[PDB]
Amino acid sequence: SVPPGDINTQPSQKIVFNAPYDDKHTYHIKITNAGGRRIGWAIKTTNMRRLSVDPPCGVLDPKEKVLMAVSCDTFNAATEDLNNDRITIEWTNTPDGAAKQFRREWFQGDGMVRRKNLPIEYNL
Amino acid sequence: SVPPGDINTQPSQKIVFNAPYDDKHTYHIKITNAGGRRIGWAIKTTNMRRLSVDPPCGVLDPKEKVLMAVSCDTFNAATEDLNNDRITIEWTNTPDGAAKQFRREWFQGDGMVRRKNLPIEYNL
């Protein structure tokens, strides 16, 4: 068993959404596999309604990178919670002999999952 | 960052439930922290209805052990699925300065979660 290696994202520590919030704002993230072995990854957000990602999961060989899309729906800042949203990237090494298709089971099995959060900062 | 150390369970690879299945059968598991640092752990089962565990989560200092309880509800083998149930133990190192109380957030943060499954074998 090996701990999945590291990944590099951009922005590296967080992500900022800028007002106005009456339009569907679609930013972008870059993920790169900074490890020695293939890995599969999947994303989770704090708001299924408000947040969206595409693609939502996948597989990267070492040093491979992917450009994914984060969106925002219209909303009303004046009354909701904005100090608490986030985007989590969970990953793990893919199994010997696996195909370039993501399989959730890879996370259920016996092993280790690595996690990275990128908080959402709302700039009004 | 450190990968959470290993844990030792007993039985070490699986768990067998023996017929007859018309009574609530309560087996037991032993978990031991075979690492160098405190860890928190929590359990998950394939059947919320049929399976049950107690206690469901906690914290073990190194070399500490816990005896937990797995149950089974009455049921009818002749028609259900028995080749697929399991019990997963997920764990991680607790954070510097944490208290002996389990906090789910420890799994959400930036880091690494370790997983161990103990399949359920039904003996008819």
Added chain:
Amino acid sequence: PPGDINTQPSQKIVFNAPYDDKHTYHIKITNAGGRRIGWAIKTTNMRRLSVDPPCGVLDPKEKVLMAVSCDTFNAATEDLNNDRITIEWTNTPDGAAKQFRREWFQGDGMVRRKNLPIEYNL
């Protein structure tokens, strides 16, 4: 010849670790016969294993539930491939009463036996 009998578990009994506690398992015996029978249990480790009851009588289609019991023991060191439980049965004799008697065993009668081996899961 005595008729078939049913056991739940049907082929084996599985004991799970840990073994530092004494564990009581339970079995189900059912007389799938047409005639009344007497039955007794025999174990391969009188020191480790234990039964209650160890014999009884069962009107056909009648059930019994027996409690096997396992003592604490060091599993590293001992033989775990040789345990077993044996059940013997035989038709009860014309006009017998609700009382098991060994003696039905010694005779010209047919004795039937079912072997339930013990499996230790470490």
Added chain:
Amino acid sequence: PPGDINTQPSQKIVFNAPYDDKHTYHIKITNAGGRRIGWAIKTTNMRRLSVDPPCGVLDPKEKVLMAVSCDTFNAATEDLNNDRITIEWTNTPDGAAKQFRREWFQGDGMVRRKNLPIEYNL
């Protein structure tokens, strides 16, 4: 003196990496005034930043949406603490038409200015 104007974002504009793609952000300007105004935008990096429109006129309570744009650039190497966007506004003159004219700027009139600095998130 020209009246207050509202900007969304209200204090700053945040640009997120990566920077290998050209990114268009957008701003909201609202004339919270009682009188009609003219306004123009000034940037701190004519090479990097870009606006459209760069000036216009706004009847009071009227809104405009402008598109800032960011070119590709190497973020390791350059100054990211000095960018900014400046907006200047001033009341439009008695009887003016739907057409911005720089010249309203040179005068005895009051010019107002709002500074929106740029923040680069790496």
